Amino acid sequence: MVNNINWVKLPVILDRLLRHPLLTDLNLETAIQYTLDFISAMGLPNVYVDKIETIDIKEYRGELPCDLISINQVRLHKNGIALRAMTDNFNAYPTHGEPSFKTQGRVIFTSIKHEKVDISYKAIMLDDEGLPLIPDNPIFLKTLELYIKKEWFTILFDMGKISPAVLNNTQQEYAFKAGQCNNEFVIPSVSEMEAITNMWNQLIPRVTEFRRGFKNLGDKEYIRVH
Amino acid sequence: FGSGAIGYEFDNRYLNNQEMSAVAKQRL
């Protein structure tokens, strides 16, 4: 992403929506739901907050943090080597290696009995209140505004209170800014493109970046002169 | 005599169907 994420609160999006005299029955309560539906459906990794925590494993099981949404990696605490996901169908089950993990809910299922792991995960930025804190980026703000407008105009079209050309134009005006908001948060910066250029340009290829925490991924690959 | 609360809403509902049809022909 080129732009930094400045955070502003959720009632920023209702300054914009209640400029429209047909969207004047929106609350924060609908916008709390319709922003979580937008933060999720875009899947933008520059919106979530990267946190790292050390959890300990009791017997192939560990308690996972409460604010987790997506795990980046899980590495051992003593070695530092990272755990691949588990393909095993019979993990902790006994009969009569490269370690792996698996997560469903608030549980992580590991392949090792008694250890400590680090978890690099992602969470939502919150407030003094317990509320989502969204970017200030006016392309993220404008397609979030067109999202809640499209989801409020759909109810007003199903009720028979909005013409077919008004929902058709909002569905078109949003679908441009949804593809645009993808490209704001995805396209690498001038600094992030050197991390790709030093990864894409490798005379001797580096294919074991997952054992480290992708630390040496963007390192420039130097060759000696003879 | 006089009462105009059904001839209103039957003339008003006649006018919804004109404009709901008129906005149904609007194409960008």
Exposed e or buried b per residue across A130-152, where buried means at least 16 C-beta atoms within 10 angstroms of its C-beta: ebbbbbebebbbbbbbbbbbbbb
Q: What approach was used to elucidate this structure?
A: cryo-EM
Resolution for this model in angstroms, one decimal place? 3.6
Rounded to a whole number of angstroms, the distance from the CA of A185 to the nearest CA of chain B is 31
Rounded to a whole number of angstroms, the distance from the CA of A207 to the nearest CA of chain B is 53
Q: Measured between alpha carbons, how far is A84 from A115 in angstroms, rounded to an integer?
A: 16
C-alpha to C-alpha distances, A10 to A29, A157, A164, nearest whole angstrom: 10, 26, 30
Q: Which of A42, A29, A1 is nearest to A13 (CA)?
A: A29
Contact B28 A168 (CB under 8 A): yes
Residues in A touching B20 (Cβ below 8 Å)? 160, 163
Residues in A touching B23 (Cβ below 8 Å)? 163-165
Q: Which residues fall within 8 angstroms of residue A41, CB to CB, at 6 or more apart?
A: none
Q: Cβ atoms within 10 A of the Cβ of A186, count?
A: 13
Contact A168 B23 (CB under 8 A): no
